[PDB]
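Slack export, channel: ligand-projects

TW: morning all. Re-posting the request from yesterday since it got buried. We need the structure predicted with the small molecule present, not the apo form. The ligand is magnesium ion; the SMILES is in the block with the sequence. No rush, but it would help planning for next week.
GE: picking it up
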Amino acid sequence: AVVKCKPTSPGRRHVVKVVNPELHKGKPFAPLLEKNSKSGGRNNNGRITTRHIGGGHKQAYRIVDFKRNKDGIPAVVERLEYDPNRSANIALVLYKDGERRYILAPKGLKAGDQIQSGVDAAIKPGNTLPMRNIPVGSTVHNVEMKPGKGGQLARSAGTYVQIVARDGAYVTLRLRSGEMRKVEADCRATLGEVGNAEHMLRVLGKAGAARWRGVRPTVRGTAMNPVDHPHGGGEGRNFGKHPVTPWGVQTKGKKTRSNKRTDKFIVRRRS
Amino acid sequence: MIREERLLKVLRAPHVSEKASTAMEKSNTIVLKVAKDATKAEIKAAVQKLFEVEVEVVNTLVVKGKVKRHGQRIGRRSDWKKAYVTLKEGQNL
Amino acid sequence: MKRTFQPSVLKRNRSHGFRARMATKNGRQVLARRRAKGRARLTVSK
RNA sequence: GCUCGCCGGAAGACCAAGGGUUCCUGUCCAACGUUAAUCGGGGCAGGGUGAGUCGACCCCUAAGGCGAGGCCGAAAGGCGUAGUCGAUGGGAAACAGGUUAAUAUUCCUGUACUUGGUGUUACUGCGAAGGGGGGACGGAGAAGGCUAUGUUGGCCGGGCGACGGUUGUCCCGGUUUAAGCGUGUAGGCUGGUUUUCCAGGCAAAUCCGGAAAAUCAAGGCUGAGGCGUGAUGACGAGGCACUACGGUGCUGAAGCAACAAAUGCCCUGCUUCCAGGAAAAGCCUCUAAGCAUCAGGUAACAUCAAAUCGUACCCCAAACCGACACAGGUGGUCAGGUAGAGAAUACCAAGGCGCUUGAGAGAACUCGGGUGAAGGAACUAGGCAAAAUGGUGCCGUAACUUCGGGAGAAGGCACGCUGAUAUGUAGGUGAGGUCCCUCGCGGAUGGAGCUGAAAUCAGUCGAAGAUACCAGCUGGCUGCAACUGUUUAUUAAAAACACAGCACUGUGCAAACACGAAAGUGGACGUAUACGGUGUGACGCCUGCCCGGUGCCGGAAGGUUAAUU
RNA sequence: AGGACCGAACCGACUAAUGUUGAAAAAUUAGCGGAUGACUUGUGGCUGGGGGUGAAAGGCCAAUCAAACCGGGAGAUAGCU
Ligand SMILES: [Mg+2]
Ligand SMILES: [Mg+2]
Ligand SMILES: [Mg+2]
Ligand SMILES: [Mg+2]
Ligand SMILES: [Mg+2]
Ligand SMILES: [Mg+2]
Ligand SMILES: [Mg+2]
Ligand SMILES: [Mg+2]
Ligand SMILES: [Mg+2]
Ligand SMILES: [Mg+2]
Ligand SMILES: [Mg+2]
Ligand SMILES: [Mg+2]
Ligand SMILES: [Mg+2]
Ligand SMILES: [Mg+2]
Ligand SMILES: [Mg+2]
Ligand SMILES: [Mg+2]
Ligand SMILES: [Mg+2]
Ligand SMILES: [Mg+2]
Ligand SMILES: [Mg+2]
Ligand SMILES: [Mg+2]
Ligand SMILES: [Mg+2]
Ligand SMILES: [Mg+2]
Ligand SMILES: [Mg+2]
Ligand SMILES: [Mg+2]
Ligand SMILES: [Mg+2]
Ligand SMILES: [Mg+2]
Ligand SMILES: [Mg+2]
Ligand SMILES: [Mg+2]
Ligand SMILES: [Mg+2]
Ligand SMILES: [Mg+2]
Ligand SMILES: [Mg+2]
Ligand SMILES: [Mg+2]
Ligand SMILES: [Mg+2]
Ligand SMILES: [Mg+2]
Ligand SMILES: [Mg+2]
Ligand SMILES: [Mg+2]
Ligand SMILES: [Mg+2]
Ligand SMILES: [Mg+2]
Ligand SMILES: [Mg+2]
Ligand SMILES: [Mg+2]
Ligand SMILES: [Mg+2]
Ligand SMILES: [Mg+2]
Ligand SMILES: [Mg+2]
Ligand SMILES: [Mg+2]
Ligand SMILES: [Mg+2]
Ligand SMILES: [Mg+2]
Ligand SMILES: [Mg+2]
Ligand SMILES: [Mg+2]
Ligand SMILES: [Mg+2]
Ligand SMILES: [Mg+2]
Ligand SMILES: [Mg+2]
Ligand SMILES: [Mg+2]
Ligand SMILES: [Mg+2]
Ligand SMILES: [Mg+2]
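GE: finished. pasting the full C-alpha cell output, ligand included:
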C-alpha cells in the first residue's frame, strides 16, 4: 500500500509514504536489543571520513540471525516488526524449544507460517538450505559468501539472487547488480525474495525528512572556492574542467575496483 | 580506641564570643577550637576524658582564614576547625 | 554580549591542570620550562 | 517620619555556574566612589557558615578518556583487549513550629524515617564473576479525576468616621496547620491457580521461555486526591506590661463551607504516528562449585554506628563574563488581585526601588515627542520616515489553482449602561432526604444552596461604547527563486547556499572512498530497493544536432619503448 | 495531521533614527522574521594549523585567519625610506 498525502502544506505536497498495518505496533523484543550510538561519519581519529552523516533519530540495534544455523527445529512466525537499522522488515520467530530470534522477513511471510533451516528442510520461503540442495534456478536471498559466515548478499528490501548454474564445488549466481559471481556450494541461502519491495516507491517530500534519517546536506564542488575543491572558483557560474571527486579523481566513468585476490570469482562484471 | 596522646593533642582552645557564651547559657554547649584533622569521635572522646563530662553529640565546622594586608603585603590567616560540643545537660564544664 | 572567556573550573583543570600537563612528555616539558624560569605558580591548579 | 513617584512573568523571591568574606557589628574618611559624604561592596578590628535524612564523597554506567599483556611504528609514539575512569543520567532515609546582628530541612521543640554492624530468641537450604525478571525510557494529542491557588459567604475581633449620608443588604482585619502512619479511592494494566513434559537461556536450575491438561472464573500489580490521625499541640487578628523607642513579655477569639481553578499531580497512564525512541548497578529471583545437627538466611526484638568535605554572602548582577560601581551577556525554579484568550498589555499586592553631581534659566541649534489652516507625494534615487489599519460575532468575498488554496481576499453591519424575559435564564456544581446491596471512598433517585454565560425586547447618556493600553493597511501588473530553511560574528539575508525530486557514474563486501608511514578506524554491526562522487534543482510540457578537440571506456594486429641480460 | 496559521517567552537581525574621543571595540529606541522544528538551550566530550570545520560567505577555529597563537632559526633579507 502506497499512500500519498494531501497537500495541506507545501512540505506535505509531495510526500508518499509506505504503510504496513501488518507490522507490530508495540515495542520490539527486548532481550534481542542493543544500543548503537551514532558516529557522525567520524573515525577513531575523530576526523570526518564519510561526508554528510549526522543527527537523525535515535535507534536501537536488533540482533538479526543472518547465519540461520539452528538446524532441525521448526520455528513459527510470531509477528512482523519495523527495523530502523535497515530497509527490510524483520520477523520475530519462536522455535519449538522456546528460543526466539529475529530474521529477515521474506515476501509473503505472515504470522503463523512455518520456517525451517537445515540440509533436510523443504523448498519454501523462509527456509535456509545449503546451496548444494537448492535447485538450479531458484530465487534466494541472504546468501553466504563463505560457509558458516552468515548471509551477506541480497539483504535489502525487495532484493533477491538467482542460482544460474551449479558446477562442482561452486554455484554461479546472478546478483541484483547484474554481476555473475561464483560461490561455494556449501554456502547457505534462504528461499524467496526480501519483502518490503514497496520501499523504493516512497518520496521523502521535504529536507527535514532526510534530516530525520541522519543525512546532512551535500554542497556542490562548483559552489565553493578553488582552495577547498577542484571544481571551485569562477566569476559567475563557470566550470571548464573534467569532473572529479573532492580529492581530484575523475568521477564520471573511471573504474576504481582493484582486487586481484577476489578476481577469480567474478564470472562477468555488471557492465 | 583512640590513644591518650592523640586525645591530648586534638583540643586547642575554648572559642570565645557572644554566640559561644549564649550557646553555653541556653543549650549547655561549649564551643572549642580543635585540630584541623580532628574528627567528631576524637573530639568527643577527648572532651569526655580531659574535661570529665558526658557528651551526647558534637557539631563541627571549618573556618576559612581571612586575607589581610600588612604594609601593602598580601597575607592570609590559616583555616581552622570549630567544634560545637553539646553536653548531657548536667555537667557545666 | 557574550565574551570569549566563560569560567568553568572542571574544564580549566582538565585542560591545563597539573595532572593534564604531567600526562604527556610535552606537558612535562612545559613544567620543566616553568620550573627553570622559576614561576611561583606552575599551573592553574591552586 | 509623613507624603510623592517607579517595577511587580520583575527592577520581587530562590538556586546552579562563577566569585571568595563582598555577610554582621564597632570604628575612620587620607586614597577609592565620576560631586559632598556623617554613607559604602572603601580603610581597620572583631564576629559569623553547626547535617545519618540537603549536596559532594560513595555505588552504577553514557559520550569519551586512560589502558597490563597485544598489534603497529626510525625514535618520540599510535591504536586497542582485559580492565579502570568519566555525569549533563540511574541508586536509602525529615517534616512543621520557634530562634541569631549575622546559620539553619544543620541549632531548639514536637513528631518521624533509612541503611548497616553486633547480640538474643524462633523457623529454615545458604551459596556467583554465571541464568532470568526489573531498572528501562520517543513525538504529538485528547479526556476525565484532583490539588496548588483564588473568590464569595458563614464565623470571630474591631469600627460608627475631618465634608452631605453611613446600626447596615455597612466598613476593616483574620479565618493557617507538615512529613509520617492507617484507609486503598476516581482510574491504569493484567485471566488466575495447581500439575506433567521439553532440541532454549555458554553447565544446573525449583527461575525464565515453550508445550499439554485440570480447576476456578476472579485474583493480582499500580494509583492522584480525600478522610482519619499527627494536633487537648503549634500558629493566630487583637489586647495588656515595660521600651534601653531597636523591641522584648504574657495571653489569646474564630479557625467553617460553597464555588472557580492550573501549563502542576494521577500520567513512565491512555489514544495515535513514524522518524521506531541510553547504559549499568541498586532490586527480585534461579541455581553451579562449596558448607553442611556449622556457617549462612528469614522474622522479631534490644543495642551500636552513619565518618569526611561544603553550608556566610552576591547570583539577569555594583560581588559572574565584558579594563569601569559599564544601558551589553548569563542555565533552572516560584508565579497573587481587577480587566483580558493570555506568562500580551494597563493599574496594583507581596516585595523591591527613585538609577552617586546638583541649582537656575526658559536663546539659536541638536535630540525624543504632541498638535496643525488650505493642499495631499507636488518631496525624493525611492512614500525613506511618518500618518494610517488594527478586536469579536455575523453577512459576504474575484481572477487563478497543484483543488489544499487564493482568503482575515475585498467590503459591510452590531458592540456602553439599565430593566425585563428570568426577584438569576440555558448550562455547571451539588447538600439534605427516600431507597437498594456482596456496607463501602457503594449504588439509584432527588434536588436546597452556590455559580452562571449568551441572546431578544424596551429604555438611557455622550461628539464618540472594539473609547485607554493593546491591536492586519488594502488592491492591480511584472522579474527572480518552487516552497519551510541557511549565509559574509562586526557595512552584503539575496536572485547566493541547501532542499525534496532527477540523471550520470563508481562500488560484490576485507566494497568503492576517506583518515592514517603502520596497526587500525569510519563507510556499516549496512550488502546494489545499499553506499560514495558529480551535476541539476518542487511540479507541468520537455530536453534537439556534433565524438572532429580534450577527458574517460574498450581493444591489442603493427610501430616505438624501462630496469634487466 | 502539519519543516500549517496569528501571536508572547525564546532564537534571530530587514528598515530607520541615535550614537561614532559611544552607556557599548557592533549597542539603544521604534518598527521587523521564525516561534512543534532542517527548532532552541544547559552540562560534558571529540576534530589542531596547509590542519580542522563549513546548508559554501574564503566563513569560522578565544575582539587575530587567502593559512591561528606562543617560542625558536633571528640581528632572515631590505639595490628602499
Ligand atoms: Mg554523500
Ligand atoms: Mg542530492
Ligand atoms: Mg562563493
Ligand atoms: Mg586546486
Ligand atoms: Mg559568465
Ligand atoms: Mg566557456
Ligand atoms: Mg545534631
Ligand atoms: Mg558540617
Ligand atoms: Mg575586603
Ligand atoms: Mg554591609
Ligand atoms: Mg572633606
Ligand atoms: Mg569625594
Ligand atoms: Mg566594608
Ligand atoms: Mg570505555
Ligand atoms: Mg588507548
Ligand atoms: Mg603495553
Ligand atoms: Mg566507575
Ligand atoms: Mg549528576
Ligand atoms: Mg542570611
Ligand atoms: Mg482546594
Ligand atoms: Mg506548554
Ligand atoms: Mg544560604
Ligand atoms: Mg552608578
Ligand atoms: Mg551592566
Ligand atoms: Mg538568554
Ligand atoms: Mg508585561
Ligand atoms: Mg526648550
Ligand atoms: Mg524635534
Ligand atoms: Mg500631529
Ligand atoms: Mg495640515
Ligand atoms: Mg484639516
Ligand atoms: Mg485625499
Ligand atoms: Mg515626483
Ligand atoms: Mg522634484
Ligand atoms: Mg516605512
Ligand atoms: Mg506610528
Ligand atoms: Mg443587557
Ligand atoms: Mg525587467
Ligand atoms: Mg527562496
Ligand atoms: Mg524564509
Ligand atoms: Mg555583515
Ligand atoms: Mg544586514
Ligand atoms: Mg573494513
Ligand atoms: Mg543550480
Ligand atoms: Mg510554522
Ligand atoms: Mg546568523
Ligand atoms: Mg529591538
Ligand atoms: Mg509564519
Ligand atoms: Mg509567528
Ligand atoms: Mg576572532
Ligand atoms: Mg604560507
Ligand atoms: Mg640564520
Ligand atoms: Mg631586522
Ligand atoms: Mg635603487
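GE: first-pass observations. Chain C has one domain: 1-46. Residues 1-46 of chain C form a domain with the Helix Hairpins fold (CATH 1.10.287.3980).
TW: perfect, thank you
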